[PDB]
A paper describes a structure:
In siphophage T5, the unique RBP is located at the extremity of a central fiber. We present the structures of T5 tail tip, determined by cryo–electron microscopy before and after interaction with its E. coli receptor, FhuA, reconstituted into nanodisc.
After a hinge region, the three pb4 monomers merge to form a 110-Å-long β helix spike, formed of a 24 β strand longitudinal mixed β sheet prism. The central fiber ends with RBPpb5, but this part of the map is poorly resolved and did not allow building an atomic model of this protein.
Author numbering:
A (entry chain i), B (entry chain h), C (entry chain j): 1 to 464, 626 to 688
Write the structure that this text describes.
Amino acid sequence: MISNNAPAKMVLNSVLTGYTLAYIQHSIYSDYDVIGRSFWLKEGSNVTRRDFTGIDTFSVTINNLKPTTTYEVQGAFYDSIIDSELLNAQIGINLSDKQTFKMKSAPRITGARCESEPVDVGVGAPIVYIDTTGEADYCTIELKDNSNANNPWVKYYVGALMPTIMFGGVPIGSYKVRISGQISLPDGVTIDSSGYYEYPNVFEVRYNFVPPAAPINIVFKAARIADGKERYDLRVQWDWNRGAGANVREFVLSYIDSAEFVRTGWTKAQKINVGAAQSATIISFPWKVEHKFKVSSIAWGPDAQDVTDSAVQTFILNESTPLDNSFVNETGIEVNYAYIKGKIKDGSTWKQTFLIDAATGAINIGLLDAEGKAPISFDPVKKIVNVDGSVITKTINAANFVMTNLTGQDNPAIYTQGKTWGDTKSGIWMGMDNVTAKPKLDIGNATQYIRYDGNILRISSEVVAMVLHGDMIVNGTVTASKIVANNAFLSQIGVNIIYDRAAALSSNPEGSYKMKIDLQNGYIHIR
Amino acid sequence: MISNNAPAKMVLNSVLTGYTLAYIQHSIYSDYDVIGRSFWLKEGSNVTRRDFTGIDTFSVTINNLKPTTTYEVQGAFYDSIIDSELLNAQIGINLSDKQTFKMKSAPRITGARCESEPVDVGVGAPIVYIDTTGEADYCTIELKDNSNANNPWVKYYVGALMPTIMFGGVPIGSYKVRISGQISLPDGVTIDSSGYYEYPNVFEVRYNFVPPAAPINIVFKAARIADGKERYDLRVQWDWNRGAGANVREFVLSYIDSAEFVRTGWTKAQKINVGAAQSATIISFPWKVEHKFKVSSIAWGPDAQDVTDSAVQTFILNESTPLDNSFVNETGIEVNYAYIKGKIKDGSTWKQTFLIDAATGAINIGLLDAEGKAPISFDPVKKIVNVDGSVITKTINAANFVMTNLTGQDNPAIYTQGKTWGDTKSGIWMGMDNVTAKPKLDIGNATQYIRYDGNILRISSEVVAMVLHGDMIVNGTVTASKIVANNAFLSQIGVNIIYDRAAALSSNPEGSYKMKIDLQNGYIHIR
Amino acid sequence: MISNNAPAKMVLNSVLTGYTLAYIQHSIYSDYDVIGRSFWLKEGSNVTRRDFTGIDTFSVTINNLKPTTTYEVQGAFYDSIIDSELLNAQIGINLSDKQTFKMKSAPRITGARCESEPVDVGVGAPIVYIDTTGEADYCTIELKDNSNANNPWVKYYVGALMPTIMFGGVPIGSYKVRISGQISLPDGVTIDSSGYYEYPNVFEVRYNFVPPAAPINIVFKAARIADGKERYDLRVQWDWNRGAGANVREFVLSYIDSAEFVRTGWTKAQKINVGAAQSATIISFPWKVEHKFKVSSIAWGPDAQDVTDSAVQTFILNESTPLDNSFVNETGIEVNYAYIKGKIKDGSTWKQTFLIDAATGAINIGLLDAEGKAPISFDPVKKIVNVDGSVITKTINAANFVMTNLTGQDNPAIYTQGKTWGDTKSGIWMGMDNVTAKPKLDIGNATQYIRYDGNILRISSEVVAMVLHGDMIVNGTVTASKIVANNAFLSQIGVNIIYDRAAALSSNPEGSYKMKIDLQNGYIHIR
């Protein structure tokens, strides 16, 4: 009736599994003869045995646990009654009920990625999205600069595991992430770590700045003029779309002369700043000289910028298709590319005085009365110098005598307008008449006057009509109808019938005489 | 003298209170007959009893703790000596001193709020301010997209509690936060959680971009001209204030013609970019044509922008109140809106030659000598064609004979200036004199000349004065004072007293003769 | 053979050292008479002793540990067999082997610093770099606003220690950091803290915005003209470098008139916006009027901006060194700063008609035939009014008779060009000839005409040549060669030899007569 009742059945109160060790909580013992414990483990197909001599300890910590497996543990006590052999056999020794414990998996990375919002401008925070799927309580994460050969590892986040671990403040450059970890145990000193695990491939952080797209739908137009001077205004309009790249910042409008691009390309070209309205204007655009127009979509990134330009689009303003042209405000001196002129506004009669036209070289002055001419207007085309009138004239240098533009029917002459050779009026006419080819002339009326034609003259008037300043040896014939004188130193005579001035000047020349010597019929009558 | 001394008094070494369970540390036992422990709890007004059979365990973990209350716990041991009845009575059984333990409150949220700095431009980090006021050691925080019906919860921060928990990197969109938690215990396996606690109302994250305010205090001014051509320069100045909205970015100056706004509104309008100086300029502004001016305060936000405009303010430059006008640099061809002219600079005498004025239509040429006229200046107003002098004249087409502008006192005439009909000078005068209504004329001196008046003539001169080219039947009277001839074929005679040229041409016509037949007194003297 | 074998040797299973307390794990006891433990500690040169009465406890927690030292601990048990004296002596009492434990150092700060990327624009996250080098598991970090006298401390990060602790979201203003900490122990209730440790000197957070540098390498140039009107175009180019300050944002080009800066400085000055191309252009620049040009490098910071300007650089365009000048497009009215003119293009002959030059005051009209003159061109310089021809002339006001510009050798005269006094031609000549100083004249041919010289006349022609309208008292001499009449009322006579018209008019005046009374030789012949 003497026996050694074996120590009571073994129970396992609590199990806490580390990565490579499990801390197991058990019950108390008896039998006064115990030596230790004999723990059996079921790996799934193979079994192992361990021994823990010394009983003062109140819990056990198995080690050398094969990674990633659920084990079944068997508790037990043994005394000197049962030897090592029977312990191997496990008969007579009490054993625990079957309990299986899970090994917490190592910290596993499942996704690493950099991301932020599409950067518009300025400096923005780039976030780091690293995803882990293990289990621990003191996980550690480290980064290393991939660029250089040596890079003392750097640890940035230490804490509990998460499906997605995100933290900012990382530098942009190359950095690859390793993963570590530890698991705690109620026994204070013991602490189990995990093997380092680096991602197979590095990743690179960068700002989300992306070059934008160039503007499209370029359209042109212009306002014809300003008030005067024909200042032609050119406006540039275009549409820029959205959907790819970065949010474009402002623009820059660049253009150059057509004839200047050929000699040199897009250097020294005309450039102006642009607003956010997608349309800038040139207020005084050259006329008839073409131009190459380009619009640039300048972007802006946190570190620098980059520009995408539209395709070249040349255009020139001409007399075709202007709009918004209500700047024709008459000012009295209307300078235009097609003409420079001076006019005087009045009522509804735009009375114009001065003009120059670059279409026919016409030069006009003074108000118009002719169909297309004015008193002192001009026309170098089909040249003509046309003028009239002169309030003050105290001089000439050449005669201004002949009349031309018709060799025969503009008779060279200075005369009274409206009267000529053969008019009863008392007007005048002088010069070289050409309807007779020689000078005509007439001064005075048609009865008391002086007439002349190039060949001959007719002066049917007297004067007081022989006034004498010299001695005459008459080369013509001296005829007459009557004669009164004081004496006569003659040469040869004629007197048909001798009257006397005793009768001649006396009344009736056949009057009182005393002897009439008629030499015609033997007539000597003596009284 | 036989007794079972009850197990010694019970002490509670340490207490650690979880949310729903308290881990209590106790002392060791004796008496060889113990069964377990009998813990009494004082809720404040009601008591509960629990039993823990089995003594191998070294500490206890009460459960089912009513939330948010300080409990008084009573430790105890009991043996088979005292039954369940006496255990209920609690007499003879030793009891512990009175200790009260506090239950740590659940994780409580007290404030949730999004905030950052007022965004000027670019992408900025929006922070999330969530405030919790509980107590735990493994607090968890999760966000959920409020927008969609289904949103797999997301956990972002795991760590110790804090008065204010702030973490960035959250998306802008809708997100509401729940709160969880756990509390650890020295016993490894046990871990107590907390019930989920979602904020009653969601909150929405957004950038701190706010529309700015429009510019104010609009003021205009202009510089009158450029060097020449009267290029009028218009400047726009305005003041933009600060204190509300976002930090404005740049501006855009838009304006349109007055007469064009009526037909169409703020479309196809003139627009230019603006700087940060709050003032942009138009270098060649139209003259006398009004304009509607608006200045836009374009903002810029991280995702997009928005513009607040000022009120319309129309203005036109005129002859009133220009400034900074020191561009009057004479160049010799001064084109102006009020006149186009050409002048020659010299010393302090701005000698001007050419002119056209858009105030009176005046057209001027050549240097001035008259009060308001020049030799070939003009004035279509009160029209007059004024010219003088001609170095070369080889032609005319009409006579240029009459004189007008005074029908009577500008006598039609071409004559020597300074001499006329009745002057002793040897000058000339011709034409239709009108102070007598008919031609006056005089060629030569006052003694040997030819005079004429429209009616009659006076030629007091001779010629070699009867030169004869024809035969004369005299229709007047042929008088005379002396006569010399070679013969005479007469008709009737008169000879008072018969002298002879034997005496007449001979000296003393009463000289040598031989018989004088005087017919007056019977006088026949024969010698 | 009776003895009290002392309790077996003392072992120390595990040691966990707090800041001020160490939790030591030990073995179990025996001997039925124990009282407690006697722990000896080796500070390095001095020893201390402690006692722990009561054995129910299974581990010990020494306190009052001198900071920052490695201690050697000695375990022990004692029974009533050995008294306090022998316990002090430590003979007979069993003692433990020698174990030394390290005290974890307090949380030490080694570096505090604010840093971010150099801010270009917008709001950016400023990070806080605080470096700690201690050891704990619940480290705490707090910030305090240095500016104000009272600032309720704020705690922002709670977690494990790290070589460098970085967290964002801090306000910019003044903030100084303190450091705290705690260390956990397996015994649940006990928790050991650390003394507060504030950095000796505060630090201030600020954005990394820094003022940029002004632009350099300023260079000027211009395009001469537009199509017409001589619109001079001025371009401004400059280079801005990189390496210090912030990334400059855009620019602003400001300039003012030279003569206006003296009166007032850089106020009311001309200003235009600028693009990122570092070059803006003025399309119509004043000519010959200098200008002061400044280019501003406006920056942009998260809160506000700041501008650094370049040095003043004045320049004026003149006839020296323009470029890109291919805007000379003839239009027929070429307005220029040096001349305003109107010309008519044709073939390779740029036929020019109208002109005004601001170099010599020349005014030109009509096509040119002279070396430097045209029919109605002008030259107020060395003044001359030159004109010719008039298609219509119906009026004059002064004679236009005299000829001048040569007092003697431009004879005042209106005459037929190419003929004068002494030519056989039938032309004319009138006026005041000056080579004789008095009028010359001739009308008609050289045989039947009227000649005149200022003094005398020669009319070698007849008329039907004595036409009589009055009665003549001849004041000259009336000579003759022949006489025919009807009667004669004479005064005194002469008749040499009495013929008769009975013979005179009859043939042979010596013909049929009847008595010839010759008074010369006593000759009375009677028939």
